[PDB]
Design a protein around this motif. Structure first.
Motif, PDB file in Angstrom:
ATOM      1  N   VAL D  41      -4.916  -7.589 -33.551  1.00 40.63           N
ATOM      2  CA  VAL D  41      -3.950  -6.987 -34.410  1.00 40.63           C
ATOM      3  C   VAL D  41      -2.885  -7.985 -34.583  1.00 40.63           C
ATOM      4  N   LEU D  42      -2.276  -7.915 -35.762  1.00 43.20           N
ATOM      5  CA  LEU D  42      -1.197  -8.711 -36.185  1.00 43.20           C
ATOM      6  C   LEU D  42      -0.013  -7.857 -36.133  1.00 43.20           C
ATOM      7  N   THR D  43       0.989  -8.312 -35.380  1.00 44.06           N
ATOM      8  CA  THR D  43       2.124  -7.537 -34.976  1.00 44.06           C
ATOM      9  C   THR D  43       3.288  -7.797 -35.885  1.00 44.06           C
ATOM     10  N   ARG D  44       4.369  -7.010 -35.701  1.00 44.94           N
ATOM     11  CA  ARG D  44       5.576  -7.174 -36.449  1.00 44.94           C
ATOM     12  C   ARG D  44       6.675  -6.689 -35.594  1.00 44.94           C
ATOM     13  N   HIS D  45       7.898  -6.941 -36.052  1.00 48.22           N
ATOM     14  CA  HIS D  45       9.101  -6.591 -35.396  1.00 48.22           C
ATOM     15  C   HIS D  45       9.534  -5.269 -35.898  1.00 48.22           C
ATOM     16  N   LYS D 132      -6.581 -10.015 -43.325  1.00 46.15           N
ATOM     17  CA  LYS D 132      -5.207  -9.851 -42.951  1.00 46.15           C
ATOM     18  C   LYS D 132      -4.760  -8.450 -42.745  1.00 46.15           C
ATOM     19  N   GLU D 133      -4.874  -7.671 -43.808  1.00 46.03           N
ATOM     20  CA  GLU D 133      -4.507  -6.300 -43.853  1.00 46.03           C
ATOM     21  C   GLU D 133      -5.435  -5.425 -43.088  1.00 46.03           C
ATOM     22  N   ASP D 134      -6.552  -5.959 -42.576  1.00 45.77           N
ATOM     23  CA  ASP D 134      -7.449  -5.220 -41.730  1.00 45.77           C
ATOM     24  C   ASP D 134      -7.180  -5.564 -40.337  1.00 45.77           C
ATOM     25  N   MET D 135      -6.183  -6.404 -40.111  1.00 52.42           N
ATOM     26  CA  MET D 135      -6.072  -7.078 -38.869  1.00 52.42           C
ATOM     27  C   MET D 135      -4.702  -6.861 -38.413  1.00 52.42           C
ATOM     28  N   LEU D 136      -4.037  -5.817 -38.934  1.00 53.22           N
ATOM     29  CA  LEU D 136      -2.668  -5.500 -38.666  1.00 53.22           C
ATOM     30  C   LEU D 136      -2.580  -4.614 -37.465  1.00 53.22           C
ATOM     31  N   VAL D 137      -1.400  -3.992 -37.309  1.00 52.64           N
ATOM     32  CA  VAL D 137      -1.063  -3.035 -36.300  1.00 52.64           C
ATOM     33  C   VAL D 137      -0.777  -1.774 -37.054  1.00 52.64           C
ATOM     34  N   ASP D 138      -1.193  -1.748 -38.331  1.00 59.03           N
ATOM     35  CA  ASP D 138      -0.834  -0.688 -39.220  1.00 59.03           C
ATOM     36  C   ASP D 138      -2.008   0.013 -39.798  1.00 59.03           C
ATOM     37  N   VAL D 139      -3.229  -0.427 -39.460  1.00 60.91           N
ATOM     38  CA  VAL D 139      -4.412   0.185 -39.999  1.00 60.91           C
ATOM     39  C   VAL D 139      -4.699   1.354 -39.121  1.00 60.91           C
ATOM     40  N   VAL D 140      -5.611   2.229 -39.554  1.00 57.13           N
ATOM     41  CA  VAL D 140      -5.862   3.442 -38.832  1.00 57.13           C
ATOM     42  C   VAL D 140      -7.284   3.480 -38.397  1.00 57.13           C
ATOM     43  N   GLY D 141      -7.984   2.330 -38.360  1.00 54.40           N
ATOM     44  CA  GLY D 141      -9.347   2.365 -37.907  1.00 54.40           C
ATOM     45  C   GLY D 141      -9.961   1.044 -38.138  1.00 54.40           C
ATOM     46  N   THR D 142     -11.290   0.964 -37.920  1.00 57.09           N
ATOM     47  CA  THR D 142     -12.076  -0.168 -38.318  1.00 57.09           C
ATOM     48  C   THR D 142     -12.396  -0.044 -39.761  1.00 57.09           C
ATOM     49  N   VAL D 165      -0.908   1.918 -22.802  1.00 60.15           N
ATOM     50  CA  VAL D 165      -0.822   0.726 -23.602  1.00 60.15           C
ATOM     51  C   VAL D 165      -0.770  -0.524 -22.791  1.00 60.15           C
ATOM     52  N   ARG D 166      -1.058  -1.656 -23.441  1.00 61.22           N
ATOM     53  CA  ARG D 166      -0.864  -2.923 -22.820  1.00 61.22           C
ATOM     54  C   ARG D 166       0.531  -3.202 -23.273  1.00 61.22           C
ATOM     55  N   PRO D 167       1.399  -3.796 -22.511  1.00 64.25           N
ATOM     56  CA  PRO D 167       2.751  -4.099 -22.935  1.00 64.25           C
ATOM     57  C   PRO D 167       2.821  -4.951 -24.164  1.00 64.25           C
ATOM     58  N   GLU D 168       1.763  -5.741 -24.413  1.00 63.77           N
ATOM     59  CA  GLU D 168       1.685  -6.780 -25.390  1.00 63.77           C
ATOM     60  C   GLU D 168       1.725  -6.119 -26.715  1.00 63.77           C
ATOM     61  N   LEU D 169       1.005  -4.989 -26.811  1.00 64.05           N
ATOM     62  CA  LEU D 169       1.069  -4.150 -27.957  1.00 64.05           C
ATOM     63  C   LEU D 169       2.204  -3.261 -27.657  1.00 64.05           C
ATOM     64  N   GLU D 170       2.927  -2.940 -28.716  1.00 62.88           N
ATOM     65  CA  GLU D 170       4.201  -2.351 -28.591  1.00 62.88           C
ATOM     66  C   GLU D 170       4.475  -1.718 -29.916  1.00 62.88           C
ATOM     67  N   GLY D 171       3.485  -1.753 -30.831  1.00 61.05           N
ATOM     68  CA  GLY D 171       3.571  -1.106 -32.103  1.00 61.05           C
ATOM     69  C   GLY D 171       2.733   0.100 -31.964  1.00 61.05           C
TER      70      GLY D 171
END
Ligand code: SF4
Ligand code: SF4
Ligand code: SF4
Ligand code: SF4
Ligand code: FES
Lengths: 127, 238, 196, 180, 166, 384
Positions: D41-45, D132-142, D165-171
């Protein structure tokens, strides 16, 4: 210590002014830098009231006539500096508790800053 | 020719020559930043400081490169004291060198970077590392200044590579740049505002940092990734 | 220790004796005298011939006497009723022109296959060996593959709109011969080691 | 000899009446640990700003070379990531992704963070080079999951849980013992 | 003549076909060891029409090409494929097979799909067993014709009319 | 006749083409024909970095992955002289032995499967899952791992690791026994195994067999004792041994090993406490990423490390080790590049296979299947 906070709050303030002047005169602004400690922040606590480490006013040539930089979070000797290109004028904002934000020891005001700006803008007027 | 011994190996190499070159011929090496191929040295980088015996030892480490050679000379480069010092100067260099690596596009070509890691490292087997003694805020100065229709300038990159300013003198003999303020307040600029010299662009290559870059390929690829295809020009009859 | 009566001998016969500070030792022999020497060793109570590593020094950033070099690892299994743990290498530089060398099938039946590999991977024909065939590779691909000269065999990886990567110039990787972007190197990037 | 034969049966018989230990998929969510490695996943702030800058450090790390990254310099007024460089194209060929994880370690934006996905499989080569957009932290599935969930109109599930959760993910919040 | 061409028949027979999947695994890699795992011991496959898990095409038509392979294996596999009955499906299991993971080499065969046509890819080396389950669920509904591609595009209910069947 | 048993059969899954010269009711000799898989890892890895090579190491051992990895690690570590924290080293053994158990689980699992009664496999597999669950925890990976890193592993253990680890050590002794319980009695077990798997100790060395073949013939030869490498010096444990080359012997050895392994675990847990998990020399080690935020020099080294990767000095190196599968070791010539100039892998099983026409002299035809299986083929050794 928590001096930090008021300073940051002041840094925003000052920045706000920089924009105001920018729009006011229509003179060019450009954000220069963002915090390292934002980039490489990545789960460690961030809480800075802006994201912006450095920013400047340029003549309209991409050449600044005024640079404005804050110190980073844990980077000691926390001050905000200004410096006028080709002037050798280096201003060191301290914060003084029980006073406010001081220029050397004289409290800063917006007008002070404007005056500095106009003399800069008009004098150096590199373009 | 001049009888040189750099540490453990001897070379003939005719006189008037720099210690430096014999060093590299000898398969011994040093960090190097100021002086360069096809250009008269200066002492400025001060990286080529060694000690020499001829047999005593100098009280001040002369920039070997700048100094001429001498027959029967000993050159000491594997000196513990050298290594320490190298690191030293490195640290000093790094003091205001702004952190920008990922977006640095000097990058794989950041020879500076490579020297750092080569010659650097704290004086201490370690059980805990050190990284710094510095901790104060860095300088913040000039960036995002287009210098030319081809060349972007972000100033705080420069190490005070004096190379380009030097180039302009040496090579075209046409000048357009200069250091400005003194001391630490200093920084190089133009007042041409776009440099009308017919030769200019070589400075990109010369820039031992990423200050002068080809904007046209700014944020387009990364240093290592490129295939660097040696081939031939035809665009002038040269 | 079993080793030692070999060592004085080696020294006597003037063979150069390589040693890494990691306590690994080679003995540089000529081809001719090998077999017999090595015969004597097994006799002297050398248990176990562990390895045969065939070496291609096609390209190396230092000179070596030969391009093809073999290396045996002989061992004395101390856990056996004989042996001392006496483990050491023998290196034997090998003319490219003649990719010959008498086998050591003769002293261990392990050897058989090991040398077979070495025919496949590097060109070496070990004299006195029953069967050469590939035992590990196609016989439809030829050129004694796994040599530096020998091709590396890459294909571009593919991504949307046909956008591709070509591996072999992608790499930021290098060899010591290779210089990369740098005009030189020294320091760490000419290697490093510790003692501390 | 003979005794054993009986004992053999004995134990197995115990186990026969033992009510089994197996877990049905996808009917009780698979048990995973937070360090598990699924789809990146591609993260954001919280600044709504994508962490990645097209660091492309990963790309040196990927031995498979599984990343096609077109870089770009962010908008100065509307920067898609606060940085001055971002990833104008972010592609990953999952058909050979190494999911290095070393990937994560090199990335300095911590953009890339392995998921908990594994529900990926389709019929076509070129569909499996996830974008890209499939590889976000914002998608809802595969990708196939999602693509199914539109044509079918059904919602989603992913059938895994972690302890937390893993701390690394935070979204993104995954099903965690409290979802499926 | 295979159970189609009346409303009834095709759904019927297709249910039959879909639900009876008999896996023949073509181990030659790490996949296999995960495959035995994939069989038992946490999850089952017998509830997906599988007691067949073993080496006869004389028992199966579900081809699971499971693992990284070499040149030497291509004609072999080809022939094995050929010695299956007429309807037959090709799973390409895992990364190692599917596009050759992290090897670019003469020895290996990259893009297993070269040797035989494929209908299902299931990446990951290793993948999770469960992914394979998800995959066969796919493959289930795929041969059921209740599937597409990621562009909405329909496709045949078999792997076996992408290149010649026999 | 010369019978041709081809690859992938039946569930023995060696690439095996086997020319069995038969008497039409006996095996005389097998000319094994193999090498129908191969990669040439050794080649490829000279075209990848040292860091990268650690990807390749578990990708040729389905079983004890971590051993390959370790062996390669050690070699490098030696070369540039890097040291490993004690805690690191603790962890490393734990994983190693855990991986050994795994291997054994799979060995016997397959043993049953291959021939003889099918079922108990599934139970051994249950336990394997437990092991896998442990691996999953700490490395996020079922198998294949990179947790081990140069200078020591790359991050701290889970706390969650401690409960579960105890737990499984409780159950296992009893479990192990119950698998053993199937074998030693079953007089049919006897009648399938005892007589076969013959080979003199003398010839075991001549044709090259490695421990648990050599030690399957009860010849003491733990490379962990003989060339004792890290921690094992200071751990008690003994050698499990047979006393003759047969299947029968092998099988029992393994069971004993497991128990030894478990005691080593037990030992390990005692010797476990906080500590840094990799070497703190940032020259040679990638730095902590919680410090990029801080210094430039960090950033520089970090960047550099993960791009170019270091230059070790020129040298050849070899370390002998005891893998689950036997004598393991890497002969690594580096030229001082960013990639090695030679990667030789010592593959034990491969050498052990040389001894097959020998092993299978004059044998009986249904027996010959087992005789292959009993030796343990991992095809990666062979094929490479
Ligand atoms: S000039 Fe060199 S050290 Fe500086 S940011 Fe660029 S690549 Fe990094
Ligand atoms: S711009 Fe570059 S070449 Fe010129 S003085 Fe600065 S560091 Fe040297
Ligand atoms: S994901 Fe990370 S490493 Fe990759 S380009 Fe983005 S910021 Fe860089
Ligand atoms: S994809 Fe991974 S698990 Fe599968 S065969 Fe390849 S290396 Fe093995
Ligand atoms: S090269 Fe810089 S002082 Fe000589």
């Amino acid at each position: 210590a928590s001096s930090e906070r008021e300073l940051y709050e002041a840094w925003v303030e000052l920045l706000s002014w920089m924009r105001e002047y920018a729009q006011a005169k229509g003179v060019r602004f450009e954000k220069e830098a963002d915090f390292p400690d934002f980039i490489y922040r990545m789960e460690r606590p961030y809480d800075l009231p802006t994201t912006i480490m450095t920013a400047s006013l340029s003549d309209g040539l991409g050449e600044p006539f005024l640079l404005a930089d804050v110190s980073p979070r844990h980077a000691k000797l926390k001050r905000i500096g200004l410096r006028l290109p080709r002037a050798h004028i280096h201003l060191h904002a301290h914060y003084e508790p029980g006073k406010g934000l001081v220029t050397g020891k004289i409290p800063l005001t917006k007008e002070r800053f404007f005056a500095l700006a106009d003399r800069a803008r008009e004098a150096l007027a590199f373009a | 020719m001049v009888r040189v011994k750099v540490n453990d190996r001897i070379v003939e190499v005719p006189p008037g020559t720099s210690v430096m070159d014999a060093v590299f011929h000898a398969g011994y090496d040093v960090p190097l930043f100021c002086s360069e191929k096809h250009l008269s040295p200066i002492g400025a980088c001060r990286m080529c400081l060694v000690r020499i015996g001829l047999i005593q030892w100098q009280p001040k480490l002369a920039a070997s490169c700048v100094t001429a050679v001498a027959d029967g000379m000993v050159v000491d480069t594997l000196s513990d004291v050298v290594r320490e010092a190298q690191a030293g100067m490195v640290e000093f260099t790094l003091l205001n060198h702004p952190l920008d690596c990922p977006t640095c596009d000097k990058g794989g070509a950041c020879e500076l970077q490579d020297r750092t890691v080569e010659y650097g490292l704290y004086e201490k087997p370690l059980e805990l590392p050190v990284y710094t003694r510095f901790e104060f805020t860095r300088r913040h100065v000039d960036k995002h200044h287009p210098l030319s229709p081809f060349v972007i300038l972000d100033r705080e990159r420069c190490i005070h590579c004096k190379r380009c300013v030097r180039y302009f003198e040496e090579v075209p003999g046409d000048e357009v740049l200069d250091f400005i303020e003194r001391g630490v307040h200093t920084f190089i600029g133009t007042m041409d505002f776009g440099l009308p010299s017919g030769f200019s662009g070589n400075i990109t290559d010369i820039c031992p940092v990423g200050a002068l870059l080809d904007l046209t390929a700014r944020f387009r690829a990364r240093n290592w990734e490129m295939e660097e295809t040696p081939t031939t020009c035809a665009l002038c009859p040269v | 220790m079993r080793l030692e009566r070999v060592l004085e001998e080696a020294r006597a016969k003037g063979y150069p004796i390589e040693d890494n500070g990691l306590g690994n030792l080679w003995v540089v022999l000529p081809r001719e005298r090998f077999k017999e020497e090595m015969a004597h060793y097994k006799a002297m109570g050398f248990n176990f011939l562990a390895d045969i590593v065939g070496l291609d020094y096609l390209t190396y950033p230092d000179p070596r006497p030969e391009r093809f070099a073999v290396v045996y690892e002989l061992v004395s299994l101390p856990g056996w009723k004989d042996g001392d743990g006496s483990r050491f290498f023998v290196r034997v530089y090998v003319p490219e022109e003649d990719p010959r060398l008498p086998t050591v099938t003769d002293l261990w039946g392990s050897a058989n296959f090991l040398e077979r590999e070495v025919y496949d991977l590097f060109g070496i024909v070990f004299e006195g060996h029953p069967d050469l065939r590939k035992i590990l590779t196609p016989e439809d691909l030829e050129g004694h593959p796994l040599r530096k000269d020998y091709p590396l065999g890459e294909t571009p990886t593919l991504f949307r709109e046909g956008r591709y990567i070509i591996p072999a110039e992608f790499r930021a990787a290098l060899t010591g011969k290779d210089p990369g972007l740098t005009f030189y190197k020294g320091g760490s990037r000419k290697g490093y080691r510790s003692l501390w | 000899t003979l005794k054993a034969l009986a004992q053999s049966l004995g134990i197995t018989l115990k186990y026969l009446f033992s009510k089994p230990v197996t877990v049905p998929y996808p009917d009780a969510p698979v048990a995973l640990k937070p360090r598990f490695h699924g789809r990146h996943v591609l993260t954001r702030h919280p600044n709504g700003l994508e962490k990645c800058i097209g660091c492309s450090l990963c790309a040196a790390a990927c031995p498979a070379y599984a990343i096609y990254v077109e870089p770009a310099e962010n908008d100065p007024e509307n920067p898609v990531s606060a940085g001055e460089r971002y990833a104008k194209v972010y592609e990953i060929n999952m058909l050979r992704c190494i999911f290095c994880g070393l990937c994560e370690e090199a990335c300095p934006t911590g953009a890339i963070v392995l998921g908990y996905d594994f529900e990926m499989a389709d019929y076509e080569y070129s569909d499996l080079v996830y974008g890209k957009e499939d590889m976000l932290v914002d998608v809802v599935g595969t990708k196939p999951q999602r693509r199914e969930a539109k044509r079918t109109g059904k919602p989603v599930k992913v059938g895994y849980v972690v302890p937390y959760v893993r701390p690394e993910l935070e979204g993104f919040k995954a099903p965690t013992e409290g979802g499926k | 003549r295979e159970g189609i061409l009346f409303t009834t028949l095709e759904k019927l027979v297709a249910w039959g076909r879909s639900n009876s999947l008999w896996p023949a695994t073509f181990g030659l890699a790490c996949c296999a060891i995960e495959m035995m795992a994939s069989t038992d011991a946490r999850n089952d496959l017998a509830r997906f029409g599988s007691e067949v898990f073993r080496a006869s095409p004389r028992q199966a038509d579900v081809m699971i090409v499971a693992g990284r392979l070499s040149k030497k294996m291509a004609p072999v596999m080809r022939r094995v494929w050929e010695q299956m009955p007429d309807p037959k499906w090709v799973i390409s299991m895992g990364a190692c097979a599917s596009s050759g993971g992290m090897f670019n080499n003469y020895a290996i065969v990259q893009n297993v799909d070269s040797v035989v046509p494929v209908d299902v890819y299931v990446p990951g080396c290793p993948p999770r067993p469960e992914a394979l389950i998800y995959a066969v669920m796919q493959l289930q509904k795929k041969v059921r014709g209740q599937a597409y591609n990621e562009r909405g595009e329909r496709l045949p209910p078999v792997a076996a009319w992408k290149r010649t069947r026999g | 006749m010369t019978l041709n048993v081809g690859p992938q059969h039946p569930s023995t899954h060696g690439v095996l083409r086997l020319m069995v010269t038969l008497s039409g009711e006996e095996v005389l000799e097998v000319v094994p024909h193999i090498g129908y898989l191969h990669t040439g890892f050794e080649k490829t890895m000279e075209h990848r970095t040292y860091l990268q090579n650690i990807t390749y190491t578990p990708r040729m051992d389905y079983l004890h992955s971590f051993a390959h990895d370790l062996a390669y690690a050690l070699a490098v570590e030696k070369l540039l002289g890097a040291v490993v924290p004690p805690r690191a080293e603790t962890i490393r053994v734990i994983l190693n032995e855990l991986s050994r158990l795994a291997s054994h689980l799979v060995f016997l699992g397959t043993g049953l499967l291959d021939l003889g009664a099918l079922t108990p496999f599934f139970y051994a597999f249950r336990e394997r899952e437990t092991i896998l669950d442990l691996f999953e925890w700490v490395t996020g990976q079922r198998f294949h791992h990179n947790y081990i890193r140069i200078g020591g592993v790359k991050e701290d253990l889970p706390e969650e690791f401690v409960p579960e680890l105890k737990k499984l050590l409780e159950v296992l002794p009893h479990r192990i026994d119950e698998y053993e319980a199937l074998f030693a009695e079953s007089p049919i077990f006897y009648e399938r195994a005892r007589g076969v798997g013959v080979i003199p100790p003398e010839v075991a060395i001549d044709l090259g067999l490695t421990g648990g073949s050599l030690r399957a013939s009860g010849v003491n030869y733990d490379v962990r004792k003989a060339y004792p490498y890290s921690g094992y010096e200071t751990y008690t444990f003994d050698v499990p041994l047979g006393e003759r080359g047969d299947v029968f012997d092998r099988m029992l050895v393994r069971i004993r090993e497991m128990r030894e392994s478990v005691k080593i675990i037990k030992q390990a847990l005692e010797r476990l406490e906080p500590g840094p998990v990799r070497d703190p020399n940032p020259q040679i080690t990638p730095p902590p990423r919680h410090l990029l935020e801080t210094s430039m020099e960090a950033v520089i080294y970090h960047f550099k490390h993960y791009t170019e990767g270091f230059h070790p000095p020129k040298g050849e190196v070899y370390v002998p080790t005891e893998s689950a599968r036997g004598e393991l070791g890497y002969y690594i010539v580096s030229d001082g590049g960013s990639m090695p100039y030679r990667v030789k892998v010592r593959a034990p099983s491969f050498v052990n296979l040389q001894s097959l026409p020998y092993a299978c002299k004059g044998e009986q035809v249904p027996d010959m299947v087992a005789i292959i299986a009993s030796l343990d083929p991992v095809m990666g050794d062979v094929d490479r």
